[PDB]
């Protein structure tokens, strides 16, 4: 359990090696969650990344945060995507917050603070405990068939999780920086791993 | 009667068959009207779609605010369209409040808070009041006859009805929050009945 | 004399036939004045519009401030006309001051609180007194011979007249809503007429 | 000796004949100097103007700041011209302070109380103290010879000039409103003489 | 060690010859380094020009923070070069920070305050300590072999260097105007020679 407050995981250059696995003490499997997470890159204008990837023995996108090229953000929940268009990207630092519930399949995205619109995504299904979570590559398999084409070449850090939906008052304090607890992973409690060329340096963005 | 107040109605997939029915105690026939209400979707870009349906056995269209692609808002009275143009939308949650008065004709349409131009739409009119008022689906006709294409795809909420034109100093506190009883429709008690694929959940704006 | 504060005239569609009369008890010829109103119409990226006509028997455009499509604010003394052009119009109500002295010929035009630069018309003209003063339609004669191709569709309020010229002081506190008094038009304390489909309703600019 | 203070010149249109002459004490050449002015006018978007002629016996462009039509500011020291770009000039009072020092040939040019980068013009020259400074024209000898295609029309006013090189925190104040004493040409103060069409007028900017 | 505080470096015209020649007491060779300093100049428009250079005996471009037309910052380190993109240049005082560490091969760039993305360049390479710094003109060899084409025209100063990387709290006091002491190069303790036509003003930036 290290104190990532204030620190980020910096990937310096493309690659098909550097990554970094967090450990969720999870035993429940998920009928909801909600995963947020500050991320800083320039390759939004050349190529799509993996901003977030949750892989399961059985399914390899159980939960992916991906940005896929002139398109915008791609958010999968066993293994069906839905997208959120993003015209005019802005080069800054960007926080996102998602969310899924399984009794209603609603997906909730929110960028920089502000709501998109609600969609519907995988109603009833239900998400795997037993979960390689793994920042800076786009998983293929249960922990590793990486593609370098997909890495994320920059910052990511305040990655937090939760097993149940937040309100638009918590997403908003958290935002903001107020304070919470998340009940999967937590930024300031977090079991992790490096592999490869990653770094902990102090945030860029406030 | 249910106090709906800080939540929304979320129809979270293109549908045929998802709505939300209002129910106004209304006896005396309208000779004025204003609605208000917040919605958000991402249809704008892409087709139209129907904000508010207000359906007479004798009318399919006798109060109508609907979204026509390419175009801006339409306002249907009687049968009778008005257009309001929109160049330039932006994604994000919009309130609108609007109004007629039988006695001039003149129609009051709010974005935002900020009024549109007045315009002229039947003059000496008089509105139905056994009326099917509908969320999230067009009506062709009493109650039903919907059209996918013509669906809401995403929220709506705070809707509110009264039998006599807002002034704009009202209509301004309406949209910074402040307090109002409304007469027809009343979203702190709203008797309403729910088909299909509808959601009740906090809502997305302020 | 009624107080038309907070309200404007209302005219809601394109009409031959709708128009105010406003009633001045002028006596001395001008050799200067002020002319301050708020109008808020959609036709400027139509067509040309009337904003306020001034008309003597002799000359049918004696004092006019126009919309002329494509290019601005037109303002007419005694006959002659000069141009203020306004690129990048908004949609929005707008007011304006305009003045004009005989002395020096100077003219001043204000949008929305900002002077346009000082232009040169009429030095040394007349301005008569006994006037036919309209809000509404373009007049081509003393009092009538209207252009429904040039009528006023939308709002006008807070028309204000004085004989002589506002400092940038003053016209600075009409602008903000500070007190006056002027001395030839008030708005306060108004003698008008009204003529076909105009109506009086609460304004809707601050 | 007139105290100009809170007045401009207007040069209301067009002409070959309307100018100021401003009178200077002056005694010694100059070996540095800086000169502030407000001035407004329209013409930026059809010719060229002239905003402030110094002219010697010798020289009738000894000191010039000028308005060259689709490319910015001219700035001219004993016949020799460097430019100042303006790309997307907008219709707007505008206050400048321009400097020159004969030690270094440094120039600077301040608009709107912003420094454009320094320049380089007439190191080691001298500028004559027997000079014709004038307003609204452009001269082509010692007193004379206007073009018209050159001259303001629009307002000029709080002129001052000093026989050294104003400091940043200096130009601030100017441009500010503080406090200060010019020694060379005084707007509180100001010796002049006008000759054709030209007025005094309440200044249009603050 | 003269104080160069708020003064500035000032280079008004394009030349070959022009330059100042920054003295470090340097003596262990550089693992890591930051690099401040503020500059003001046109030229981004029509050519590319050196910020910074930095020369070795053995690399002529040891560190350099190079300005390349079209494209935007350029960053090199033992010559090798990664670029910063800028698009839509606004003509202003610019204040960067520049870091690069050996251990990591992470640089830093900072834009009036702001971080760009983390990048790659020179992983366990070794900054050499017997250098030629040098204001003005970009080298070719060590202290010598200018281009024009790349020379700077316009301000520089305020520039600070560290052996060590800022963190982003320091660099934001250090642009923010607060306390610091740099070990490497002071502006407020410069030793410094001077060539050609550079001269010493006080700065146009706060
Ligand atoms: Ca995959
Ligand atoms: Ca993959
Ligand atoms: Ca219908
Ligand atoms: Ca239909
Ligand atoms: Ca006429
Ligand atoms: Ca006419
Ligand atoms: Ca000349
Ligand atoms: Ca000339
Ligand atoms: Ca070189
Ligand atoms: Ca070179």
Redesign the interface.
Known sequence: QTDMSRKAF?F??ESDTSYVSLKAPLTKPLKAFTVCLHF???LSSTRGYSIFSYATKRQDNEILIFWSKDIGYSFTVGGSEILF?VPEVT??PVHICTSWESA???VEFWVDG???????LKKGYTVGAEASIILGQEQDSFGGNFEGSQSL???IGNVNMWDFVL???EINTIYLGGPFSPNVLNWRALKYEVQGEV?T????WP
Not at 114 to 120: D, I, N
Not at 201 to 204: A, D, E, G, N, Y
Request: glycine residues 6%; proline residues 13%; without cysteine.
């Open positions: 910096v310096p250059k800083y890159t320039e268009e080069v800054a209603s399949g609603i502000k709501p998109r619109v609600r969609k519907s070449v920059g910052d309100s638009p008052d770094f340096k102090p945030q860029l």
